Amino acid sequence: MVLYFIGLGLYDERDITVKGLEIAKRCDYVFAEFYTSLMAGTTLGRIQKLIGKEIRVLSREDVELNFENIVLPLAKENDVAFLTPGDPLVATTHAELRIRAKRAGVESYVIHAPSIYSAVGITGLHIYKFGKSATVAYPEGNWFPTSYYDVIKENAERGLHTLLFLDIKAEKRMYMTANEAMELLLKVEDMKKGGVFTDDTLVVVLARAGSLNPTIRAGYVKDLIREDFGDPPHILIVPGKLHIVEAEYLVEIAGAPREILRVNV
Amino acid sequence: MVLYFIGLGLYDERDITVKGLEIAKRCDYVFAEFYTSLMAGTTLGRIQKLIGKEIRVLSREDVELNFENIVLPLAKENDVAFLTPGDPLVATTHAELRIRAKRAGVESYVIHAPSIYSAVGITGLHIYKFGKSATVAYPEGNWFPTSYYDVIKENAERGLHTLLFLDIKAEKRMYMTANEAMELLLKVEDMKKGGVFTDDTLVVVLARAGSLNPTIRAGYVKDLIREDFGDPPHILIVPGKLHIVEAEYLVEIAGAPREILRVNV
Ligand SMILES: Nc1ncnc2c1ncn2[C@@H]1O[C@H](CSCC[C@H](N)C(=O)O)[C@@H](O)[C@H]1O
């Protein structure tokens, strides 16, 4: 008589919270989606082993078009869980699924898990200083998305940092790298010419957050644009004006150029 | 030779991740701090029993002044864990501790966990629309801090949501309630007259995130200012203009009045 939205966390099957695991273990049916993000350190099998249940994976269409026909029916007579990478309600449209649950007479509960949205704290940048976030989407056909560029501009003007979620084509197994994101931004800059993103812009890259050894790198676009940051997923950040302590961490932990220590107040 | 920064999550002892628990269990020494925030749904005793290790609590002074004399020495020759509420490094002062570790010749790794910063996704508000964050501090003596009011103004002005962390006297375990925060903001408004926070302002209250029964309420200040949102902790959010999908979730899940579907969209 219930539906649980349970996050699996950032990188592997152990990133699920103890709360989420104990609840999942007792559910009658377990569903999941793996298109909203990439968990690079585990497999469906390892997750199934940990929870001790068979997991039915749903596609974007299964969820967005038939969540109420595939999941909710069973939730009316059983305890059902719906697993997702990271936190189920961060940078996804899953929140609306709670309304479908309500209209189907199914109570729903949310179990949080580590999210990339807060994990960026590991870059040393103050979390409260992050402004509006955006997603760098792959251009398609004659369409070239550029809204993420304006987000950076607006935040930077306020001295805020910008978190850039990178695109993902789960079914095609394509995961945008920070390198590709940088290349796209430089092209948008050539078009709008707002001096927002150039070869001299300081950026931070975080790859495989959640693993024990994620790649954390800070430096100028000209220097990092061709650097190997390892396997996906990747996230790109364009810092605003830095506090001295943020610069110190970027230098000491993320290998940034020591010159950024000399902040221009 | 290794120091592990492990997040305890949102509310109780089960909000730690499976990864964090297993690592904490195999650590020779386990330290923890409860000054950046508290774990309202559990106790030190319950956390200790779960980890199966003695936990030495450290004060703000122990950490800020003597982290390198209390924690690092043992981490130099043993596996040491440093537990913190929420997600490690979201609190601004945590990051610097990794630099101290580096200088002492000690390796450090971060084990993430759910943070209120990302858990607000349960309010139905799109995470990318959250702007700069702020903390509402209790005024005292002749000191009346109001920077948090300006943060709301700047965010709402750009159509962004404002997450307001509420003050907490960790040592005395005193939590500021959403009600007190609303009263304070009305007080600041009466002072600055910026038309930023009034009886007609739409707000969202999230209490006990992480719990299976959090209180999620949305409505106008005039109606929520004296409402009972349950036990701590409380988080207050002043959303910017709403996407219809956000408004529908607030109405269906947070009990918001239908009026927001026309006034705040
Ligand atoms: N472990 C990780 N490391 C780096 N980026 C990550 C990441 N997990 C997610 N992302 C980033 O976020 C995008 C998915 S957005 C969905 C995020 C998810 N609900 C969460 O709470 O984390 C990815 O394409 C990537 O750019």
UniProtKB/Swiss-Prot annotation, chains A, B:
Keywords: Methyltransferase, S-adenosyl-L-methionine, Transferase. GO terms for molecular function: diphthine synthase activity. Its EC number is 2.1.1.98. SUPFAM superfamilies: Tetrapyrrole methylase. GO terms for biological process: methylation; protein histidyl modification to diphthamide. S-adenosyl-L-methionine binds at residues 10, 87, 90, 115-116, 166, 209, 234. InterPro entries: 4pyrrol_Mease, 4pyrrol_Methylase_sf, 4pyrrole_Mease_sub1, 4pyrrole_Mease_sub2, Dphthn_synthase. It is an enzyme of class 2 (transferase). It catalyses: 2-[(3S)-amino-3-carboxypropyl]-L-histidyl-[translation elongation factor 2] + 3 S-adenosyl-L-methionine = diphthine-[translation elongation factor 2] + 3 S-adenosyl-L-homocysteine + 3 H(+). Gene3D superfamilies: Cobalt-precorrin-4 Transmethylase, Domain 1, Methyltransferase, Cobalt-precorrin-4 Transmethylase, Domain 2. Pathway: Protein modification; peptidyl-diphthamide biosynthesis. CDD domains: DHP5_DphB (cd11647). The keyword Metal-binding does not apply. Pfam families: TP_methylase (PF00590). Homodimer. The diphthine intermediate is not stable in vitro and readily eliminates the trimethylamino group. It is not known whether the elimination reaction also occurs physiologically. S-adenosyl-L-methionine-dependent methyltransferase that catalyzes the trimethylation of the amino group of the modified target histidine residue in translation elongation factor 2 (EF-2), to form an intermediate called diphthine. The three successive methylation reactions represent the second step of diphthamide biosynthesis. PANTHER family: DIPHTHINE METHYL ESTER SYNTHASE (PTHR10882:SF0), DIPHTHINE SYNTHASE (PTHR10882). Belongs to the diphthine synthase family. This is Diphthine synthase.
